[PDB]
Structures are given as structure tokens and as C-alpha cells.
Amino acid sequence: FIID
Amino acid sequence: MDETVAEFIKRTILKIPMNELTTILKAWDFLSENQLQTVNFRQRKESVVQHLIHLCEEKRASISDAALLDIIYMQFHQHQKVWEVFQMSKGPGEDVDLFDMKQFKNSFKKILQRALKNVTVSFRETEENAVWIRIAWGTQYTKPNQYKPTYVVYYSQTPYAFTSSSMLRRNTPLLGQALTIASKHHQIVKMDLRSRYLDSLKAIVFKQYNQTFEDSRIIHENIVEKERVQRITQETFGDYPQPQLEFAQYKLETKFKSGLNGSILAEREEPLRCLIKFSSPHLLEALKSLAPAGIADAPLSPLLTCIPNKRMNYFKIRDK
Amino acid sequence: DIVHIWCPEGMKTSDIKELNIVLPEFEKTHLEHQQRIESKVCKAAIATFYVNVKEQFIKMLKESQMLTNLKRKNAKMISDIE
Amino acid sequence: LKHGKTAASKRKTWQPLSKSTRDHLQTMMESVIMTILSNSIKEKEEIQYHLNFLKKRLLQQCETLKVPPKKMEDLTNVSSLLNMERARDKANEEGLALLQEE
Amino acid sequence: FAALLTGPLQRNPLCNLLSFTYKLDPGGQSFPFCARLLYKDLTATLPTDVTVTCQGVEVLSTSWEEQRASHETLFCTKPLHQVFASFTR
Numbered sequence: 001f002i003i004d
Numbered sequence: 005m006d007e008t009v010a011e012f013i014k015r016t017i018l019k020i021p022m023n024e025l026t027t028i029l030k031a032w033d034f035l036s037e038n039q040l041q042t043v044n045f046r047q048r049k050e051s052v053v054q055h056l057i058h059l060c061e062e063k064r065a066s067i068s069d070a071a072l073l074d075i076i077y078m079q080f081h082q083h084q085k086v087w088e089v090f091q092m093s094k095g096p097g098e099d100v101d102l103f104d105m106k107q108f109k110n111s112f113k114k115i116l117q118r119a120l121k122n123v124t125v126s127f128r129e130t131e132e133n134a135v136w137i138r139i140a141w142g143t144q145y146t147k148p149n150q151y152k153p154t155y156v157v158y159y160s161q162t163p164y165a166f167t168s169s170s171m172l173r174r175n176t177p178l179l180g181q182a183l184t185i186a187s188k189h190h191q192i193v194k195m196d197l198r199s200r201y202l203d204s205l206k207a208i209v210f211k212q213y214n215q216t217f218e219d220s221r222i223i224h225e226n227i228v229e230k231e232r233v234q235r236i237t238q239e240t241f242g243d244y245p246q247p248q249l250e251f252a253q254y255k256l257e258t259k260f261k262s263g264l265n266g267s268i269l270a271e272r273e274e275p276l277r278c279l280i281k282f283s284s285p286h287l288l289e290a291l292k293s294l295a296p297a298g299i300a301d302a303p304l305s306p307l308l309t310c311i312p313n314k315r316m317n318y319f320k321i322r323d324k
Numbered sequence: 325d326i327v328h329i330w331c332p333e334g335m336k337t338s339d340i341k342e343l344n345i346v347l348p349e350f351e352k353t354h355l356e357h358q359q360r361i362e363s364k365v366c367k368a369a370i371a372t373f374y375v376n377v378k379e380q381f382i383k384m385l386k387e388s389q390m391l392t393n394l395k396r397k398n399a400k401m402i403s404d405i406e
Numbered sequence: 407l408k409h410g411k412t413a414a415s416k417r418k419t420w421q422p423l424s425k426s427t428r429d430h431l432q433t434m435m436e437s438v439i440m441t442i443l444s445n446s447i448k449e450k451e452e453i454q455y456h457l458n459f460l461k462k463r464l465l466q467q468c469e470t471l472k473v474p475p476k477k478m479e480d481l482t483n484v485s486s487l488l489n490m491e492r493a494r495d496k497a498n499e500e501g502l503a504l505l506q507e508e
Numbered sequence: 509f510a511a512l513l514t515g516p517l518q519r520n521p522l523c524n525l526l527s528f529t530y531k532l533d534p535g536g537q538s539f540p541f542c543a544r545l546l547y548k549d550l551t552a553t554l555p556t557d558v559t560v561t562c563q564g565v566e567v568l569s570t571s572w573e574e575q576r577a578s579h580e581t582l583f584c585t586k587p588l589h590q591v592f593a594s595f596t597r
Binding site: 325326327329330331332333340341342343345346348349350353357361365366369370372373374376377380384387388390391394395397398401405 | 407408409410411412413414423424427434438439442446449452453456457458459463464467468471473474476478479481484487488491492494495498501502505
Binding site: 099100101102103104105106132133160161 | 521546
């Protein structure tokens with residue numbers, strides 16, 4: 001769960 | 005006296021109700037108080053349109069005086085328009101900035117009279133030095149867009165701004181860089197966060213409003229479960245007052261993988277595109293009641309708890 | 325159905341106005357009035373009416389094409405300003 | 407000037423001629439009656455009678471002729487309607503002078 | 509000390525640049541003095557850049573040049589609440  | 009700017013004077017009388025009609029005209033402070041008690045406010049509303057148009061004729065109001073009334077009407081009624089946020093960046097090699105209000109009001113006026121020939125610029129200074137800016141967009145020929153204005157909120161020292169959504173999207177790089185040059189910055193970044201309450205969007209960003217502190221016959225067998233599902237919500241959310249956000253669009257391009265099914269999308273390499281919107285008021289204290297209800301897991305996901313922290317609601321999620 | 329419409333050269337189908345049908349109707353009823361009059365000084369005034377008014381029909385169509393010329397100039401320049 | 411020869415399908419959406427076209431044609435008929443009577447010497451009565459019979463006939467044939475319903479400019483104010491795009495085309499020349507020189 | 513100043517005031521919340529116009533009576537004539545206080549060090553209280561101008565007349569003797577030299581020394585080495593109490597002295 002990373003936000004780009 | 006022009007007729008088309010006198011239509012906007014009688015429009016804002018029709019757009020205010022009679023209970024807060026004395027609140028707007030005392031803060032407008034252009035008419036004297038003996039003429040406010042002369043006009044009977046207890047009569048028919050179309051007589052209030054006829055009596056106030058004689059007061060605007062004999063005192064010789066202008067296009068800046070009628071746009072001064074539009075700011076005070078949108079200050080007490082902040083619910084009709086949304087507010088997107090702009091993020092300005094401080095350049096390298098800078099330690100202190102030089103700001104002046106007389107240097108701000110002429111540099112923002114000359115940057116809009118040069119680009120377009122019909123731009124109506126009106127200013128109003130409020131409490132703790134916040135400038136409130138109306139822009140009426142005219143293109144090349146007509147007197148500008150009086151029915152659909154555009155508002156810029158700027159607090160005279162912050163690099164953060166609260167700008168409303170205009171219906172003319174082609175002038176939105178023109179409005180952003182004009183605030184960048186006059187406030188001595190070098191980069192404008194449109195940050196993706198929007199709501200309909202301006203008082204809640206200044207609480208979630210500026211973070212000065214969020215924290216204000218200085219029988220054995222009904223016995224449960226779930227001792228390990230009952231205070232486990234509420235201890236995560238007290239160390240993250242708590243019973244403290246929270247700002248209001250009512251919208252969050254979640255653009256998912258994630259995949260499907262689970263240990264229960266072994267033949268459901270076991271050969272798919274293509275992404276499953278999705279978009280998940282939330283349309284409910286006061287969402288930050290609405291999701292905290294699902295965990296003592298038992299319909300949600302006590303390890304709550306961090307995408308719903310980083311919303312006052314990471315300072316946006318538009319998220320893009322990647323998962324295998 | 326061989327009734328005529330007189331237009332200047334360079335026009336299209338969607339540019340046909342209302343004055344280009346009345347002008348062949350102006351000359352069709354012009355010859356039907358001349359045949360009932362035997363006076364030579366009365367037919368010369370209608371021949372004076374045939375020259376100067378048709379000159380104003382050329383003048384009202386040359387002004388009308390310049391109204392459409394600067395309207396298309398205002399539509400072409402607005403792509404150049406933008 | 408080229409030919410006509412209309413279709414049989416065009417005669418279904420036709421309209422009569424507008425009022426502001428006929429009011430300018432009534433105005434220039436009264437200007438050209440005063441042009442001939444200032445230029446005539448004798449027999450001013452019956453030459454006027456053949457022109458009032460002609461303008462009765464020419465306004466009758468405009469009521470019977472059917473025109474297409476496409477929009478046109480007003481012919482009555484044709485000296486003043488011509489000048490008002492010249493004030494706007496000059497406004498785009500100085501509007502270019504606020505743009506090209508900057 | 510708002511009764512000694514004339515005209516409106518323009519204040520920023522960081523107070524890095526100040527502007528106020530006041531009047532004094534050194535010899536019986538009202539002298540409108542416009543002082544602009546710009547700050548060069550953000551971690552300090554005392555001013556660094558002091559520019560004091562006059563809005564009214566300036567064709568006079570050597571009294572106002574000695575006064576403008578007196579305001580520029582008493583704004584750098586004296587704080588602003590103590591120099592307003594010296595103006596009533």
C-alpha cells in the first residue's frame with residue numbers, strides 16, 4: 001500500500 | 005447608472021432570506037443607519053427590492069461596491085461552493101520573504117489587466133489579515149461573468165490557498181500563476197483536496213482546530229475482544245472533535261489474489277480498474293463506529309486514517 | 325420550375341439569403357407595367373427607375389457581402405488571438 | 407449571376423418575408439419618389455400615379471413570394487450596423503497590440 | 509498611541525514590514541512623519557532597516573534633518589514601546  | 009450591474013444588486017436581495025438580511029447590511033457599512041430603519045423590513049420581499057434600489061441610486065454605487073456585497077454574502081454562506089486547495093513552494097536560496105499589502109494589491113491588479121481586457125478585481129480585508137478576492141472573467145468583448153464568480157482565499161502569509169471551482173476551466177493556469185508572482189513564489193502545485201465547508205478545510209490543513217486539550221448476569225465472555233476493537237480507534241481517532249470531509253475518490257488499479265479460491269482469476273495478468281467514491285457527511289467520525297459494531301476488523305486499514313495526516317483524499321492504490 | 329435566383333460568384337448552398345429571389349421578381353413585374361403605358365416621357369422615368377434602383381440593389385448586396393466578410397474575419401482572428 | 411431552377415422538396419419549410427426588410431424597402435421607395443420629383447420639371451401628377459401603382463404591385467409580390475427562414479441583418483440601420491463591427495475589429499487590433507508587443 | 513497617528517494602518521501578521529504615519533509637535537507645527545520598519549533578521553525583535561520619510565513639507569531649516577537623524581538612532585537601539593513613551597516626554 002504505497003500512494004503514487 | 006448601468007442596467008446590467010443594477011441587475012446584480014437586485015439579485016443579491018433576492019438571494020438572501022429576511023432573517024439574516026440585517027446581518028449583511030450592517031457589515032456592508034456603506035449606507036447610514038437612519039436609512040436602514042426607514043426601509044420597513046417586515047413588508048413584502050419585492051418591496052425590499054424596490055426600496056433598496058433607490059438607496060443604491062442616490063449614493064452612486066459602482067462595480068466595486070456591488071462586488072463588496074458579494075463577498076459578505078459568500079462569507080456567511082460558505083456552503084454553496086466547493087473549495088480546491090493550491091500549494092505554493094518556497095524556492096532554494098531563500099530564508100525570509102518580503103510581503104506588503106500595498107505591494108500585493110497593485111501587482112495582482114496589473115497582472116490581470118495586462119492579460120485580459122475585462123477582469124473585475126475586488127478586495128476585502130478581514131480578521132487576522134485575510135484577503136478575499138473576486139474575479140469576474142470576461143473574454144474579449146462582453147462585460148464579465150457576473151452570475152458565475154470565482155473566489156480566492158489567501159491568508160497573507162501562508163503558501164496555502166483556498167480557491168473555488170470556476171465554470172471556465174481554461175483560465176485556471178492563468179489564475180494560479182498570477183497568485184504565484186504577486187506573493188513572491190516560484191512554483192504552484194494544485195493539491196487534490198476539496199469539500200463544501202470552508203471552515204472544516206481550514207481545520208484539517210492548518211491543524212490548529214483538531215486538538216483542544218491542555219451485575220454478573222450480563223457479563224461477556226469476550227474479554228479479549230471487547231476492548232481490542234476500540235483501542236485502535238482511541239489511539240488514532242479518539243473521542244476528540246474532528247474536521248468534516250464528505251468526499252474521497254479512491255482510484256484502484258489493483259489485482260485479485262486470495263488464499264480461499266484457487267481457480268478464480270488464477271491466470272489473469274491484467275489489472276482490475278476501479279474507482280471508489282464516498283458520498284456521506286462527517287466521514288471521519290462515521291467510520292469509527294463500525295469497529296465496536298463488529299462489522300469491521302480491529303486492524304483498520306491505514307488508507308482511512310491518513311486523511312487528516314497526508315492532507316489529500318484522492319488516492320491511487322497499487323496492489324498485486 | 326425554371327424560376328431564377330441571381331447570386332454573385334463564390335457563394336455556397338448555406339449562404340443563400342432572401343434578397344436573391346426578390347431581385348428576379350423585381351424585373352419580371354417591371355416589364356408588365358411598361359406595356360400598359362404608351363407615353364414616351366412616362367416610360368423614360370421607369371427607365372430612370374430601372375437604372376438607379378438596380379444600382380442600389382447592387383449596392384445593398386455589395387454591402388451585405390462585406391458584412392459577411394468581416395464576420396468571417398472576426399471568426400478567423402479569434403483563433404489567432406487564442 | 408448564375409441560374410436558379412429550384413427543387414420540389416425545398417417548398418415545405420419556406421416562410422414569408424420579414425417586416426424589417428419591407429420597412430427599408432418602403433423607406434428607399436419614398437426616398438426615390440423625392441429624388442425623381444426634385445429632378446422632374448413637368449407632368450408631376452400622373453408619373454406619381456404610375457409609381458404609386460408600381461409600389462402597390464411590388465409590395466404585393468413580396469407578400470406572395472416565399473423566402474427561406476435563414477437569418478439576415480437589419481437593412482434599416484445598415485449605415486449604423488456596418489460601423490459597429492469596425493469598432494470591434496479595431497479593438498482586436500489594439501488587443502493584438504496589447505499581446506504582440508508584450 | 510493610536511490617537512497620535514493619522515490615517516489607516518496596514519499590518520501583516522509576520523510583521524516583517526511595518527508602516528505607520530504619525531504627527532509630532534516639536535515647535536508648534538504638525539510634522540507628518542511616515543516611518544517604514546523593515547526587518548533583516550527574523551530571529552530578533554529590534555529593527556535593522558529604518559526608513560523614515562515626511563509626507564508634508566520639507567523646505568525648512570536644519571531642525572527636521574536633526575529630527576530624522578534622531579528617529580533613526582532611537583529606532584535601532586531602543587524598542588518600540590519605550591520610544592513611544594519618550595515621544596510623550
